[PDB]
Nucleic acid binder design. Structure first.
Length: 79
DNA sequence: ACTTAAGAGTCATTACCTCTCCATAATGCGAATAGTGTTGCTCATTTGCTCAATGA
Protein backbone atom coordinates (compact mmCIF):
# COMPACT_ATOMS: atom_id res chain seq x y z
CA UNK A 1 0.00 0.00 0.00
CA UNK A 2 2.89 2.41 0.67
CA UNK A 3 4.81 1.83 -2.57
CA UNK A 4 1.84 2.62 -4.81
CA UNK A 5 1.12 6.24 -3.79
CA UNK A 6 4.58 7.82 -3.83
CA UNK A 7 3.41 9.84 -6.85
CA UNK A 8 0.85 11.42 -4.50
CA UNK A 9 3.72 12.47 -2.22
CA UNK A 10 5.63 14.12 -5.09
CA UNK A 11 2.37 15.73 -6.24
CA UNK A 12 1.83 17.33 -2.81
CA UNK A 13 5.47 18.32 -2.24
CA UNK A 14 5.74 19.88 -5.72
CA UNK A 15 4.22 23.10 -4.35
CA UNK A 16 6.27 23.39 -1.12
CA UNK A 17 9.60 23.46 -2.99
CA UNK A 18 11.13 26.92 -2.45
CA UNK A 19 10.15 27.30 1.21
CA UNK A 20 13.63 26.92 2.71
CA UNK A 21 14.02 23.15 2.33
CA UNK A 22 15.35 20.84 -0.38
CA UNK A 23 12.93 19.02 -2.68
CA UNK A 24 14.13 15.58 -1.60
CA UNK A 25 13.65 16.31 2.12
CA UNK A 26 10.01 17.23 1.38
CA UNK A 27 9.11 13.96 -0.35
CA UNK A 28 10.98 12.00 2.33
CA UNK A 29 8.92 13.58 5.13
CA UNK A 30 5.87 13.11 2.92
CA UNK A 31 6.68 9.39 2.81
CA UNK A 32 6.76 9.40 6.64
CA UNK A 33 3.31 11.01 6.65
CA UNK A 34 2.15 8.50 4.02
CA UNK A 35 3.15 5.61 6.30
CA UNK A 36 1.30 7.26 9.21
CA UNK A 37 -1.78 7.55 6.98
CA UNK A 38 -1.54 3.91 5.84
CA UNK A 39 -1.38 2.66 9.44
CA UNK A 40 -4.52 4.56 10.52
CA UNK A 41 -6.70 4.22 7.41
CA UNK A 42 -10.31 3.01 7.53
CA UNK A 43 -11.88 1.79 4.29
CA UNK A 44 -15.52 1.67 5.43
CA UNK A 45 -16.18 5.39 4.80
CA UNK A 46 -16.26 4.87 1.02
CA UNK A 47 -13.21 7.04 0.26
CA UNK A 48 -10.47 5.39 -1.72
CA UNK A 49 -7.07 6.34 -0.31
CA UNK A 50 -6.23 9.85 -1.43
CA UNK A 51 -8.68 12.03 0.51
CA UNK A 52 -7.36 10.54 3.77
CA UNK A 53 -3.68 10.45 2.77
CA UNK A 54 -3.51 14.07 1.53
CA UNK A 55 -4.13 15.53 5.01
CA UNK A 56 -1.38 13.48 6.66
CA UNK A 57 1.13 14.16 3.86
CA UNK A 58 0.39 17.91 4.01
CA UNK A 59 0.71 17.85 7.82
CA UNK A 60 4.10 16.09 7.73
CA UNK A 61 5.44 18.43 5.04
CA UNK A 62 4.21 21.53 6.90
CA UNK A 63 5.64 20.34 10.23
CA UNK A 64 8.91 19.63 8.42
CA UNK A 65 9.22 23.12 6.92
CA UNK A 66 8.05 24.84 10.11
CA UNK A 67 10.92 23.42 12.19
CA UNK A 68 13.90 22.34 10.08
CA UNK A 69 14.01 25.36 7.74
CA UNK A 70 15.58 28.09 9.91
CA UNK A 71 18.37 28.33 12.46
CA UNK A 72 16.36 30.50 14.85
CA UNK A 73 13.44 28.08 15.16
CA UNK A 74 10.00 29.48 15.93
CA UNK A 75 7.37 26.96 17.11
CA UNK A 76 4.27 26.49 15.00
CA UNK A 77 1.86 27.98 17.57
CA UNK A 78 3.92 31.19 17.89
CA UNK A 79 4.24 31.71 14.12
C1' DA B 1 50.96 -6.64 -27.02
C1' DC B 2 51.26 -0.66 -27.68
C1' DT B 3 49.02 4.83 -29.35
C1' DT B 4 46.03 8.36 -30.00
C1' DA B 5 41.17 10.63 -28.22
C1' DA B 6 37.66 11.75 -24.07
C1' DG B 7 37.01 13.20 -19.83
C1' DA B 8 38.13 14.92 -15.19
C1' DG B 9 40.87 18.07 -12.20
C1' DT B 10 43.28 22.41 -10.89
C1' DC B 11 45.46 26.76 -11.00
C1' DA B 12 45.22 31.77 -13.41
C1' DT B 13 49.27 38.75 -8.71
C1' DT B 14 49.13 42.03 -4.36
C1' DA B 15 47.14 45.88 -1.28
C1' DC B 16 43.47 49.51 -0.29
C1' DC B 17 38.84 52.68 -0.74
C1' DT B 18 33.40 53.51 -1.59
C1' DC B 19 28.31 51.88 -2.21
C1' DT B 20 23.95 48.31 -1.66
C1' DC B 21 21.78 43.86 0.03
C1' DC B 22 21.19 39.31 2.96
C1' DA B 23 12.85 35.82 2.98
C1' DT B 24 8.15 34.45 4.01
C1' DA B 25 3.02 31.08 5.94
C1' DA B 26 -2.58 26.05 8.45
C1' DT B 27 -5.62 25.07 11.14
C1' DG B 28 -7.08 23.63 16.53
C1' DC B 29 -7.01 20.96 21.29
C1' DG B 30 -5.63 18.69 25.27
C1' DA B 31 -1.10 16.60 27.80
C1' DA B 32 2.84 17.44 29.59
C1' DT B 33 6.77 19.71 30.85
C1' DA B 34 9.63 23.87 31.95
C1' DG B 35 9.37 28.35 34.10
C1' DT B 36 8.25 31.76 37.49
C1' DG B 37 6.40 33.30 41.84
C1' DT B 38 6.01 32.51 47.32
C1' DT B 39 7.37 31.74 51.93
C1' DG B 40 10.27 30.10 55.24
C1' DC B 41 14.75 29.39 56.16
C1' DT B 42 20.21 29.02 56.47
C1' DC B 43 24.85 30.67 55.53
C1' DA B 44 29.02 33.67 54.29
C1' DT B 45 30.88 38.47 54.61
C1' DT B 46 32.21 42.86 56.89
C1' DT B 47 32.40 46.49 60.49
C1' DG B 48 31.91 49.10 64.52
C1' DC B 49 32.58 47.76 68.91
C1' DT B 50 34.28 45.25 73.12
C1' DC B 51 37.78 42.65 76.11
C1' DA B 52 42.62 41.24 77.70
C1' DA B 53 47.98 41.97 78.39
C1' DT B 54 51.83 45.54 78.67
C1' DG B 55 55.32 49.20 79.14
C1' DA B 56 55.64 54.09 79.86
Amino acid sequence: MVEANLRLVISIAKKYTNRGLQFLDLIQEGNIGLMKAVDKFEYRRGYKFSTYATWWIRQAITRSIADQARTIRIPVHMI
